[PDB]
Amino acid sequence: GRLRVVVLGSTGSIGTQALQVIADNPDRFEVVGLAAGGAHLDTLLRQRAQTGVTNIAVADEHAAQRVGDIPYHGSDAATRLVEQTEADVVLNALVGALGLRPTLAALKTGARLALANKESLVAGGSLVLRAARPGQIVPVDSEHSALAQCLRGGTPDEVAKLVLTASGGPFRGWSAADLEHVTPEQAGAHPTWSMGPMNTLNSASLVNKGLEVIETHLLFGIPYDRIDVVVHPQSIIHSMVTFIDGSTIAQASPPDMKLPISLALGWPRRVSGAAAACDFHTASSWEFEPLDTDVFPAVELARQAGVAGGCMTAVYNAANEEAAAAFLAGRIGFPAIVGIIADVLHAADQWAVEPATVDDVLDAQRWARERAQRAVSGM
Amino acid sequence: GRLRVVVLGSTGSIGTQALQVIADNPDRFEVVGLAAGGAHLDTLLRQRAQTGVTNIAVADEHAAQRVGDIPYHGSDAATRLVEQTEADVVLNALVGALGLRPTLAALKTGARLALANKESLVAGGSLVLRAARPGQIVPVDSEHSALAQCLRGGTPDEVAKLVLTASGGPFRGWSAADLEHVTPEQAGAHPTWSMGPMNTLNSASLVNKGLEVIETHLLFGIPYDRIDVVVHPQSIIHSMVTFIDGSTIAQASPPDMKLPISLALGWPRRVSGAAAACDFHTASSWEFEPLDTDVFPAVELARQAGVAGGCMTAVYNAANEEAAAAFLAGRIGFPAIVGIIADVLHAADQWAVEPATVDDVLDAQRWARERAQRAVSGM
Ligand SMILES: NC(=O)C1=CN([C@@H]2O[C@H](COP(=O)(O)OP(=O)(O)OC[C@H]3O[C@@H](n4cnc5c(N)ncnc54)[C@H](OP(=O)(O)O)[C@@H]3O)[C@@H](O)[C@H]2O)C=CC1
Ligand SMILES: NC(=O)C1=CN([C@@H]2O[C@H](COP(=O)(O)OP(=O)(O)OC[C@H]3O[C@@H](n4cnc5c(N)ncnc54)[C@H](OP(=O)(O)O)[C@@H]3O)[C@@H](O)[C@H]2O)C=CC1
Ligand SMILES: O=CN(O)CCCP(=O)(O)O
Ligand SMILES: [Mn+2]
Ligand SMILES: [Mn+2]
């Protein structure tokens, strides 16, 4: 039958790509809700006009003032839309802290949650896991989607290791000395129209990989010492699972987020024609190499944060946001991003307690931000 | 509740590796029958002593006499061993189309057929299929083991293509002129697998891969035009499945037949520690290139034979067996192997008829062997 889909973050990269998959597959999906921030209000309004969906939410009141016929506006607008809309699937493609409450609300409705919002898991952690039922959360990102597919190759008891691939970023194979003089531009901080500067930087710093390692633990219930990372420059193999017999199962496709998006939406059913497959008519190679964890310790730090548990991963992420921004403003050098994360985490043991509420997570993030600010400024 | 396993061809490459898996896993497996040709009595006698199994078949009458007290001897020994031994699994690791009757007898008992002896299924065609219940034939071949694992990545209707990898053999990259000079000693080399001299030859000539394409169609019911072959010199990726959404699922491990053996014996349950896993703590690459079908047409000829159906696959194999014997004896050049197969196949119009009995298959092979000898005489 047709799945009713709520798209949260309809004006961003994931959201718009999802809407294309849905437009291409009217047999499999129908949009029944759209939520956006308001920065791209004009796009949301064009989306209302194109899709015919009037069930929309805008967070920013100022932006909402420009329209006068938005059913959900102001803070918690997305959350209210989720609470009040009958749906089969909620795609949470919201950015940052504010994806958390809608994740919780969507889980309570009993819909499947196609999750892109990293903060829901990296920050929300045990709040989100205690609220979600088995199979309810389906990951949107390429590595997690790949692991979900590869896990089909055996029972849960047969898994030995999860292996995330990592592009390695622009500084793949760079020495510590090389990294000393990395500039914001080199770190891929261009005013690229769709993605924010943080995504390319997190990729370059290997912090994104650490975040993905944390999310892997929470999604698939695999201990951190069994979650590995290999550097794979082509990004054709999106991740792999190694089983107890020594067999490894791997997922491969030319880069294209429409594949994992389509699969998250239709899970467990694949969407015909979603993306192009690997073509073996011209010679190619898939290369693998280890990550030098002395030069790139962000993944080791993520495992430490993850193992400590509670709000420690919220701390890891919030420290990064602050240090990364400080790097982009020229307040610190590149190697000092992960240096500050380590300094903040080392000081953060009070946050190992499990959060009872969203406010607990926010307090952990507040603490981590100001602690990172002190480290940056020298105060 | 150990599985009771009869091991046909115990003294060969697959047989010995299989006994090693069983020896390491006495909780899961027990040997209850051994069959061999009689050429390696030292090995067989050691196997009798180490397993404690006296329920033994020896094909060669004189060799069986030399041992004394062999319960089954003569060319029907292996077949009669299968018929009269209660077992849960029959591992058929005989070589050549002579494994046909043991294969048919094994299926008739209701036991799982762990099939290394691809030739018996290639020769038997729909006759073997009609004797099998669904999933009764479980492949030991590394490619088909990989395919079975990767097919867990979706439903049947989601399968777009099956992709077999091929090492490309010792003469990968060689021109037709280069092949003219190939010696039996050069064809006895293999870059990635340690095997008997016949399977090694078949690998060098690509006839092995042709046999495996036919085996794929017969095992999995996928049409020949959706079975691709890609050359992968590392033999780390063992085969892949491409799904309708563009996703490809691949199986990978360092070349070690103990992996597919262990899984075939214990299907669906994996066998802990059966083989070493891919090691991502050191650099490596997985390379792919197209097969050069002009220089190596054996796979195309297999597709032709397979599409024709009936007893045509038996003809393909039998012609190879005769031609291969003549190459190893120094009577014909290396290119003549596949030239003879082409000559025989294209004279075989009458053998497209579906086999009703074993005798139909035997008739087809008898003709093919004579026709192959005619081709050899003409050179
Ligand atoms: N792009 C990718 O491939 C990857 C995605 N992810 C993560 O998935 C999430 C979504 O991906 P992406 O589309 O690129 O993120 P985007 O930044 O491109 O889009 C974010 C969406 O959230 C909306 N939004 C912002 N603030 C609010 C608010 N207060 N209430 C409701 N909605 C709000 C935005 O609306 P408006 O535009 O009007 O502000 C926008 O539609 C991201 O957080 C990203 O980190 C993870 C790995 C990689
Ligand atoms: N070797 C490998 O790695 C791989 C093999 N395979 C397949 O597995 C099958 C077995 O191959 P492999 O183990 O390499 O071959 P081998 O030649 O190593 O072994 C052949 C076995 O069959 C026995 N045998 C020979 N003739 C007869 C006969 N007339 N009656 C009864 N037994 C006989 C031999 O006994 P003896 O010599 O003692 O008389 C020996 O035990 C082949 O069909 C091959 O295609 C597939 C994947 C890879
Ligand atoms: O199952 C494994 N084999 O048959 C050995 C494959 C060697 P090849 O790809 O060169 O035919
Ligand atoms: Mn990713
Ligand atoms: Mn094989």
Swiss-Prot record, chains A, B:
Pathway(s) of this molecule: Isoprenoid biosynthesis; isopentenyl diphosphate biosynthesis via DXP pathway; isopentenyl diphosphate from 1-deoxy-D-xylulose 5-phosphate: step 1/6
UniProt keyword Membrane present: no
Keywords: Isoprene biosynthesis, Manganese, Metal-binding, NADP, Oxidoreductase
A GO molecular-function descriptor: cobalt ion binding
Annotated InterPro entries: DXP_reductoisomerase, DXP_reductoisomerase_C, DXP_reductoisomerase_N, DXPR_C, DXPR_C_sf, NAD(P)-bd_dom_sf
EC id: 1.1.1.267
One record GO biological process: isopentenyl diphosphate biosynthetic process, methylerythritol 4-phosphate pathway involved in terpenoid biosynthetic process
Binding-site positions, 1-deoxy-D-xylulose 5-phosphate: K118, S142, E143, S167, H190, S203, N208, K209, E212
RNA-binding is among the record's keywords: no
Catalytic reactions on record: 2-C-methyl-D-erythritol 4-phosphate + NADP(+) = 1-deoxy-D-xylulose 5-phosphate + NADPH + H(+)
NCBIfam families: Dxr
Entry-linked HAMAP family: DXP_reductoisom
Family stated for the protein in its record: Belongs to the DXR family.
Described purpose of this protein according to its UniProt entry: Catalyzes the NADPH-dependent rearrangement and reduction of 1-deoxy-D-xylulose-5-phosphate (DXP) to 2-C-methyl-D-erythritol 4-phosphate (MEP).
Protein known as: 1-deoxy-D-xylulose 5-phosphate reductoisomerase
Organism (species): Mycobacterium tuberculosis (strain ATCC 25618 / H37Rv)
Gene name in the database record: dxr
